[PDB]
């Protein structure tokens, strides 16, 4: 599953709903802190819809637990990331992933 360690608190009133577009900045890393993806490096906030499987299950689940403005570290185990396969070239098999996620807006 997903564990969340808060970095900055959110507002505690605005949580993502099912189907809702959330806008985040994120950095996706392997368990050693090696970055494999970052919206920050693109200078473009990333949008996806909660519960529509547009991102890995753990990312979606983690963001659903966050309130607007919150920044959190998500620890995501392989069964809710890329599993035993992994992502060839990108994510090794059975990889635990760490995402630094900031919830910037809900649409």
Author numbering: 1 to 107
What do the authors say?
The human genome encodes two homologous 12 kDa FK506-binding proteins, FKBP12 and FKBP12.6, which differ at 18 residue positions. The primary known physiological function of FKBP12.6 involves its role in regulating the RyR2 isoform of ryanodine receptor Ca2+ channels in cardiac muscle, pancreatic β islets and the central nervous system. Similarly, both FKBP12 and FKBP12.6 can bind the immunosuppressant rapamycin to form an inhibitory ternary complex with the protein kinase mTOR (mammalian target of rapamycin), which plays a major role in regulating cell growth and cancer progression. X-ray structures at 1.70 and 1.90 Å resolution from P21 and P3121 crystal forms are reported for an unligated cysteine-free variant of FKBP12.6 which exhibit a notable diversity of conformations.
A survey of crystallization conditions for the cysteine-free variant of FKBP12.6 yielded two distinct crystal forms, one belonging to space group P21, yielding a data set at 1.70 Å resolution, and one belonging to space group P3121, yielding a data set at 1.90 Å resolution. The two non-equivalent monomers in the asymmetric unit of the P3121 crystal form differ from each other by only 0.35 Å r.m.s.d. for all of the backbone heavy atoms. In contrast, both of these unligated FKBP12.6 monomers differ from the rapamycin-inhibited FKBP12.6 by an appreciably larger backbone r.m.s.d. of 0.81 Å. These larger differences primarily arise from the transition between a type I and a type II turn for residues Gln31–Lys34 in the unligated and rapamycin-bound crystals, respectively. As illustrated by the P3121 crystal form of the unligated protein, the interactions surrounding residue 76 are largely similar to those for the rapamycin-inhibited wild-type FKBP12.6, with the maximum backbone perturbation occurring at Val80 Cα, which is displaced by less than 0.7 Å owing to steric inter­action with Cγ2 of the substituted isoleucine side chain. Despite the close alignment of the backbone heavy atoms for the two non-equivalent monomers in the asymmetric unit of the P3121 crystal form (0.35 Å r.m.s.d.), the orientation of the aromatic ring of Phe59 at the base of the active-site cleft is strikingly different. In molecule B the phenylalanine ring superimposes upon that seen in the rapamycin-inhibited FKBP12.6, which in turn is closely similar to the orientation of the Trp59 ring in the numerous X-ray structures of the wild-type FKBP12 protein. In one monomer from the P3121 crystal form, the aromatic ring of Phe59 at the base of the active site is rotated perpendicular to its typical orientation, generating a steric conflict for the immunosuppressant-binding mode. The reoriented aromatic ring of Phe59 in the presently reported structure of FKBP12.6 likewise partially occludes the active-site binding pocket.
